[PDB]
């Protein structure tokens, strides 16, 4: 018999299977279509989602009800210290897919990235890249030969980089290594740029710009085994249902005599990789720039870090990306920011954003103040204040 009343299906079937991510750092599956006109630059960056905060700005879209009026918007502040370039991996294109040809590493690797190559760094002999850093001796003849072979056969050039996670307040000292594709001149220009930038840092203000429309790629917040009612949003069964009501009633008809794949079933929720596109940047701050939490209208002496630090994370002391709206993943988690895959010419994305006020009130509850100076002025001198 036909379904008596039609209803849209629960959940999205294009995000299956809802299993855990392969690793805690989501892979950038696709990269912007390279053109060989603009100078060589990275097509992504690695950061750590510090948290969220509130901002005020003038909406600047003609024809709207709020044109030239205040709006309050939620933004996510991502801690993004400059990433160190450590290796160049060349890619040839084969009928079986793009295949890596060779990787050439830098002579000296930092301890925080050498930790990535061990699971038991505390007791390891730390021999990684010993017989490779010895290959840079005698003016690196093999290294230059390998780079020449990369130029000879390399259709796409990606650079291995890692985050200076020791700059973050995270407890983990094992850095994350990632491949970011170089978009720019020819293969020789790309590899020459990477060789110049061996064991050298790249800061965010050189890859991203203000009002740029980016994508955030990250593994979402894990939630363990979850019932169908919250995992797919199916209707809860009536209150008087035997054997429980947080289920799906009919999991399929008699024929086909199998449970269909498209049926909501209990399983893991969260901890999947997610690429969320079209988030606009609102401010690319500088870590060494104190009072970066103020604006031309605010003009206070407060940094982006709220009072009492970002909850569960700490303070912000490096270059950050303040991106409008939420991004997948929770705090402390690495997130890969990426340039937009298409030229988004919509008037919602072509706006010029000038932040009018950046909140710094404590995220640890309902705090009333932005700065300790403001709090002291409002509350007067306390007994502990002596």
């Amino acid at each position: 018999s036909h379904r008596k009343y039609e209803a849209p299906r629960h959940g999205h079937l294009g995000f299956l299977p809802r299993k855990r991510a392969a690793s805690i750092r989501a892979r950038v599956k696709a990269f912007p279509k390279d053109d060989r006109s603009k100078p060589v630059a990275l097509t992504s960056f690695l950061g750590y989602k510090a948290g969220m905060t509130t901002i005020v700005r003038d909406l600047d879209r003609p024809g709207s009800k709020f044109h030239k009026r205040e709006v309050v918007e939620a933004v996510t502040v991502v801690d993004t210290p400059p990433v160190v370039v450590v290796g160049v991996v060349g890619y040839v294109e084969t009928p079986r897919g793009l295949r890596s040809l060779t990787t050439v590493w830098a002579e000296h690797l930092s301890d925080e990235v050498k930790r990535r190559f061990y699971k038991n760094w505390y007791k390891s002999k730390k021999k990684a890249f010993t017989k490779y850093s010895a290959k840079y001796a005698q003016d690196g003849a093999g290294i230059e030969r390998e780079l020449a072979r990369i130029k000879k056969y390399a259709s796409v050039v990606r650079v291995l980089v890692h985050t200076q996670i020791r700059k973050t307040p995270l407890a983990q000292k094992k850095a994350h290594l990632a491949e970011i594709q170089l978009n720019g001149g020819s293969i020789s220009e790309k590899v020459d740029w990477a060789r110049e930038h061996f064991e050298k840092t790249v800061a965010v203000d050189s890859v991203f710009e203000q009002n740029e429309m980016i994508d955030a790629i990250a593994v979402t917040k894990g939630h363990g085994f979850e019932g169908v009612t919250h995992r797919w949003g199916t209707k809860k069964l009536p209150r008087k249902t035997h054997r429980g009501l947080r289920k799906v009633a009919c999991i399929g008809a008699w024929h086909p005599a199998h449970v269909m794949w498209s049926v909501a079933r209990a399983g893991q929720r969260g901890y999947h990789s997610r690429t969320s596109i079209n988030h606009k940047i609102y401010r690319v701050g500088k870590g060494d720039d104190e009072a970066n939490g103020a604006t031309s209208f605010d003009r206070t002496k407060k940094t982006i870090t709220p009072m009492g630090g970002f909850v569960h994370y700490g303070e912000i002391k490096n270059d950050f990306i303040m991106v409008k709206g939420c991004i997948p993943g929770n705090r402390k988690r690495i997130v890969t920011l990426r340039k937009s895959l298409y030229t988004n010419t919509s008037r919602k994305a072509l706006e010029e954003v000038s932040l009018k006020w950046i909140d710094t009130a404590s995220k640890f509850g309902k705090g009333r103040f932005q700065t300790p100076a403001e709090k002291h002025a409002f509350m007067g001198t306390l007994k502990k204040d002596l």
Binding site: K356, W357, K366, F378, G380
Partner: protein
């Protein structure tokens, strides 16, 4: 943008922080938090609530400044 003043508490309300209440007689109250909002709905006297700016003003708490 501008910072408001709590109607019950006197605490500053920064944009988006708190709630706004419109009584039947069109009187406008702004509450920095559910604490102040719930106290107001319970109709406790701000003059009598110890930590309120109204209580501080009445009892000259820190008024020597």
């Amino acid at each position: 943008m501008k910072v408001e003043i709590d109607s019950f508490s006197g605490a500053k309300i920064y944009p988006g922080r708190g709630t706004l209440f419109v009584r039947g007689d069109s009187k406008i109250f702004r509450f920095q938090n559910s604490k102040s909002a719930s106290l107001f709905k319970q109709r406790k006297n701000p003059r009598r609530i110890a930590w309120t700016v109204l209580f501080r003003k009445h009892h000259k708490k820190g008024i020597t400044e």
